Amino acid sequence: APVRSLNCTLRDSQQKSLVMSGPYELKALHLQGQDMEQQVVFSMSFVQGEESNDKIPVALGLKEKNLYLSCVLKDDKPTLQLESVDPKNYPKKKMEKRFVFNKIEINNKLEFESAQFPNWYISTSQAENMPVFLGGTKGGQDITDFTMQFVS
Numbered sequence: 001a002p003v004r005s006l007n008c009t010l011r012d013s014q015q016k017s018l019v020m021s022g023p024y025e026l027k028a029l030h031l032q033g034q035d036m037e038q039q040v041v042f043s044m045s046f047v048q049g050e051e052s053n054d055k056i057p058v059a060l061g062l063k064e065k066n067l068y069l070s071c072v073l074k075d076d077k078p079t080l081q082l083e084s085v086d087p088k089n090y091p092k093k094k095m096e097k098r099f100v101f102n103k104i105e106i107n108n109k110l111e112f113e114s115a116q117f118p119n120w121y122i123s124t125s126q127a128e129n130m131p132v133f134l135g136g137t138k139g140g141q142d143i144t145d146f147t148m149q150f151v152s
């Protein structure tokens with residue numbers, strides 16, 4: 001059958017929102033009111049991979065764009081990027097591993113661990129208007145916990 005996908009937004013546990021701000025550049029900032037139209041809407045696909053009650057493999061595409069979050073080595077470090085794909089072939093159930101996140105539910109929050117790079121997480125900074133990034137350090141200054149809002 002097709003791959004199953006849900007539209008959603010994400011906010012970090014400090015309640016910062018995710019917006020595009022430049023070519024392939026996703027940043028996190030405090031947003032409320034009219035400006036909330038600026039937030040990125042994801043198409044979260046439920047993909048093939050190792051699964052348990054609280055660890056669910058997903059891909060995170062941008063709604064109606066041929067763009068996915070992906071985890072690659074850059075200058076020898078695990079690195080979050082936006083990657084373009086052939087729009088004829090995506091989304092699909094068997095997404096390549098660089099596109100796969102383990103969506104983990106702990107204490108009413110979500111963490112997104114790289115399937116490719118164990119114990120590296122989608123992260124934000126405490127400061128406003130900085131990149132969303134991959135974070136191999138948890139519980140420090142990096143925010144690895146999120147909430148999801150379902151979108152029509």
Ligand SMILES: C[C@H](N)c1ccc(NC(=O)C2CC2)cc1
Pocket residue numbers: 024025026027080081082131132133
């Ligand atoms: C989508 C990916 N998470 C991402 C990667 C890089 C940036 N920004 C920069 O690299 C600018 C400071 C030099 C933003 C978002």
